[PDB]
Design a binder for this molecule. Structure first.
Ligand SMILES: Nc1ncnc2c1ncn2[C@@H]1O[C@H](COP(=O)(O)O)[C@@H](O)[C@H]1O
Ligand SMILES: Nc1ncnc2c1ncn2[C@@H]1O[C@H](COP(=O)(O)O)[C@@H](O)[C@H]1O
Ligand SMILES: Nc1ncnc2c1ncn2[C@@H]1O[C@H](COP(=O)(O)O)[C@@H](O)[C@H]1O
Ligand SMILES: Nc1ncnc2c1ncn2[C@@H]1O[C@H](COP(=O)(O)O)[C@@H](O)[C@H]1O
Ligand SMILES: O=[P-]([O-])[O-]
Ligand SMILES: O=[P-]([O-])[O-]
Ligand SMILES: O=[P-]([O-])[O-]
Ligand SMILES: O=[P-]([O-])[O-]
Ligand SMILES: [Cl-]
Ligand SMILES: [Cl-]
Ligand SMILES: [Mg+2]
Ligand SMILES: [Mg+2]
Ligand SMILES: [Mg+2]
Ligand SMILES: [Mg+2]
Ligand SMILES: [Mg+2]
Ligand SMILES: [Mg+2]
Ligand SMILES: [Mg+2]
Ligand SMILES: [Mg+2]
Ligand SMILES: [Mg+2]
Ligand SMILES: [Mg+2]
Ligand SMILES: [Mg+2]
Ligand SMILES: [Mg+2]
Ligand SMILES: [Zn+2]
Ligand SMILES: [Zn+2]
Ligand SMILES: [Zn+2]
Ligand SMILES: [Zn+2]
Lengths: 308, 308, 308, 308
């Protein structure tokens, strides 16, 4: 049950013209190339390579009109000759600070349909995450995994290195209602707002006699978010004094993972509203991100409410 | 400059009989098999498989007399017919809690020469880490890496998946004198001793106007220790109220990484003495572990001194 | 320029509904699995495995109604629930006698559209090769190659083991007008007809002072035919006293390679008519096969004419 | 039961100083690199690359004094600083005419000990094949295989692409006493001597009512010789009018395969004496080669005797 076969079958079921199917295949081919490069990087700038692979694969798919990448200042408008209806926002390599120590790193993407009647522009990439058509990530960890949703839940696929294809390993994954792990960079504690300080105190010093949550923070958002999906708990990169609007990027970091987490029955908030409901105003806009098991995110939101 | 060629060349230089060379090759062959299994695990109990691979490879090398594994209650005495002079302590798969979320995991080992004149027994595995002949780890991360020392510094090798061999990527690596990352499970904060609480407070709320250290904690000791080696900083798993003697295991977790870190110019302490100077009293003995950049470990030791 | 991307792009250009595209992808996925098994066969009945992979991949593609395999006595009718419009004739593993000595082996296939209005049956697989929609082969040699035509010439793709995908290496390949290699099992010389004896004598003892042709015969038809395509010359498995109708099978050996060779500007004959014009009367029908560079096949046909 | 472990174990049993063991490992590492290059050649002069890999690997092993390669006019004398006792004759890539059509190709080698007391020179590479210390070949076919003998029979190993190591698949292989396949380029029939013409006639037109032998000729000597080993029969590249001393090269083609075939219980002759007994007079000397199942080679020798 390979990913390409799965994607083509889902396309058949959806009665699609093949356009999204070609796009997804092109994205996944880029991911396979990136995986191979990551697995031999030290022997063989990974941002630049990954970015080129994704842009070229996507543009040549005849399915795109606008791309937004972390690595490009401006939106990339597809040549008229190759122009299709989809807009792709992506982070070609997430976790760059973890490349050299061989920690898990990733690729993140969200796909939208152009709905405007205008000439294609950056504005077509400023849709709310609620309008996502498909989104997901690749995790280049101890094994290579893709999480993908096209709106009917989250499916996990793993690269079979012998076969050279991604194979379905879990269909329609659901996050636990409550976890026992909290994940954030506590090195920013001095800069936290009151709500974040209070929540973290609740995790480490519970007042109901429960065991403190365990702490984990890989420092690669895709790795920490994937763990949150499969083990439950909470991941936070809130606003702080040094990053008053948060650090993570709305279009190509936060919206894709918020989509996956919500699809799996979790929550993803800025602290004031769901990430997927934020209307983007600029392509490299930052937002706070708190996501994971719904009961844990709900508890964080109570801390925000109590301190507002 | 492949690992097997490198190991055989080092053997030639050492005027060895070939015994340690055969042992190291056998260990590294087990590591390659484990890597392959890890990279396809979700599709294809990893503790049990890895343990069997290592025991079989080591015993059949004709270089061992005693093995200690995390996965075996008692020391494993090699059959007389296959008996050599070396004692190997190993953790066949480190980071088991991180297997399912695809975070970096590893294999850890230390090799000793039997120095007693007695029949081989568990006592031959109770040498201080100072007596290590060779030690190191494999990290199954975004790429596969081996760190190895035979007493002349730390060398890093990376698996070339196309060639099917480990290749030298860095010779004689040295840790930074001081880093900017601290790494420990802060979920145990409620249970910390005063020295640990004070040190962590110093990292998050410096009193000299310096920037707080960043926090990272993968939760797989090999991954966190490897990051500490290549980026600098400090890794801690101190004793706490729930684990009054620490959690990590002296023979096959702490001594091997202490050896690597000291070889790279770092420090590794229990809080009261160097890990490598602890005389083991039992094969599955636990010890506290604080290691990394020497100035950072020295600062931790000042906190211990101040609170004793 | 990967095969999956290439096939999807050709589908887009053809304005296809995606049905043939899904079929081709499914076939090529089976080929990748077979390649992997072949490359580790001695360590790890290859007919049975390959056959199962192909049948399962094809049926689950929702693109087929009838399959004919060398390994199945009767045509395989696709379940109504999974039924599409295409008929696939295939040899899941060609060159079985060469498996154990590690010579090049292969997979061969031809795809037809069902044109009858009747319930699907073996009769839908009895079209002349002229009615082929797509055909080709995989060659599991020193590298893994696919030759594929959908009617616009022959394209060659090679498996990149690092990427895990087939990549285009040659577009629209054309056979040489005349070659210098002849390829047949001369162990059947005692049983040859007069025309074959005369032709072979002309190749070994030319009467115009030209150099004799070189002889090559791997004994795996896909390997010998592929060499004929890329180097030129002639390949023969004519009728003989022991095999009066030839040995090779019309539906899933001869028609697919005849299609590739004709598409590349060569000829493929039974000795009396083009292979592609033979009307099949039974699914496992045998025919004589003589193919390759047009001037060489034309010379063979002159020998047939002269001896009729 | 991996090749490196096997070679080191055989070294231990032989009480070797490790010198031959290091040499063999270096040769086998070159073979693994060549295999990888061959498997991706079309995408990625193969003679030149393979030659460089072998020379560099061998020289840096500290085990050699003299190398002879097909690709170098003169013997290559190892720098005094890296000088060991062994002489290696090799064909870094055998079957160059078959590279582009993806037929099986190979690497061939024979190892000798320097026995002279003189400064090392080409003369040290002019030993008779009887003096071989170790010899064998790699076959880059549908899978990758090494045949190796160090004087205690022929062992076959196959590359496990997942593990990245050669694994033992057959120990102490013996050729059949008589086969049913004959293998030679019959395109040279016009130039054959009387004995070769008579023998080939006996294979195609037996005079005792037996079935004619089947014909096979890949045209890559390593592939044809390997088939001869595992299936039995006979392989010939005799002298002919265009090549009065034969075509194949004594030092690095004929002696290595003659050694393997004799070790497996077969015969290898020039037509007048065993190949292994020929005293080489020049490093690129050619000899006729007829080898395989002993009863078949004996029959060929009767034809030589009858026509002398
Ligand atoms: N491969 C696929 N998987 C899931 N949904 C799809 C797929 N292809 C198309 N769809 C759905 O059908 C719509 C139209 O597809 P298309 O005609 O390819 O643009 C898309 O926007 C998706 O919502
Ligand atoms: N491959 C090697 N690399 C580094 N040191 C070695 C190697 N082989 C042997 N030695 C050193 O030489 C000693 C004796 O080797 P052996 O005779 O193989 O037990 C070992 O305990 C090591 O200290
Ligand atoms: N991927 C493709 N490559 C080449 N030709 C195609 C492809 N898909 C469809 N076609 C052509 O279009 C016809 C209809 O395609 P379909 O609607 O998928 O059955 C096929 O029978 C082919 O002749
Ligand atoms: N790995 C090995 N396998 C088989 N025979 C070996 C091996 N190593 C050494 N020998 C035999 O022992 C001799 C001396 O080995 P060395 O001291 O390494 O030159 C060689 O010439 C071989 O005949
Ligand atoms: O590491 P990142 O900024 O995608
Ligand atoms: O995960 P660990 O106990 O080696
Ligand atoms: O070897 P074959 O009968 O496909
Ligand atoms: O193809 P060859 O001359 O080794
Ligand atoms: Cl990680
Ligand atoms: Cl072949
Ligand atoms: Mg990035
Ligand atoms: Mg990122
Ligand atoms: Mg970045
Ligand atoms: Mg463990
Ligand atoms: Mg452990
Ligand atoms: Mg454990
Ligand atoms: Mg077959
Ligand atoms: Mg066949
Ligand atoms: Mg068959
Ligand atoms: Mg050659
Ligand atoms: Mg050759
Ligand atoms: Mg040559
Ligand atoms: Zn990013
Ligand atoms: Zn452990
Ligand atoms: Zn067949
Ligand atoms: Zn050669």
């Amino acid at each position: 049950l390979t990913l390409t076969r799965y994607v083509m079958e889902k396309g058949r079921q959806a009665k699609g013209t093949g356009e999204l199917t070609r796009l997804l295949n092109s994205m996944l081919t880029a991911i396979k190339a990136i995986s191979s490069a990551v697995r031999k990087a030290g022997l063989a700038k990974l941002d630049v390579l990954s970015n080129s692979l994704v842009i070229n694969m996507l543009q040549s798919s005849y399915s795109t009109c606008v791309l937004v990448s972390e690595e490009n200042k401006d939106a990339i408008i597809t040549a008229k000759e190759k122009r299709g209806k989809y807009v792709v926002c992506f982070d070609p390599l997430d976790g760059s600070s973890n490349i050299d120590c061989l920690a898990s790193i990733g690729t993140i993407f969200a796909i939208y349909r152009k709905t405007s009647e205008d000439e294609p522009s950056e504005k077509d990439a400023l849709q709310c995450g609620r309008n996502i058509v498909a989104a997901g990530y690749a995790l280049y960890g101890s094994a290579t995994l893709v999480a993908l949703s096209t709106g009917q839940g989250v499916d996990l696929f793993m690269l079979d290195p012998a076969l050279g294809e991604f194979v379905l390993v879990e269909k329609d994954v659901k996050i636990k209602k409550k976890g026992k792990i909290y994940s954030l960079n506590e090195g920013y504690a001095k800069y936290f707002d009151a709500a974040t300080t209070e929540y973290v105190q609740k995790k480490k010093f519970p007042e109901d006699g429960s065991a403190p949550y365990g702490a984990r923070y890989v420092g690669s958002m895709v790795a920490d978010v994937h763990r949150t999906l499969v083990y439950g708990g909470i991941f936070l990169y809130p606003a702080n004094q040094k990053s008053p609007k948060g650090k993570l990027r709305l279009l190509y970091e936060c919206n894709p993972v918020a989509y996956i987490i919500e699809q799996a029955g979790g929550l993803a908030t800025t602290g004031t509203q769901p990430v997927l409901d934020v209307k983007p105003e600029a392509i490299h806009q930052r937002v706070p991100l708190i996501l994971g098991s719904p009961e844990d995110v709900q508890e964080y939101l109570t801390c925000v409410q109590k301190n507002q």
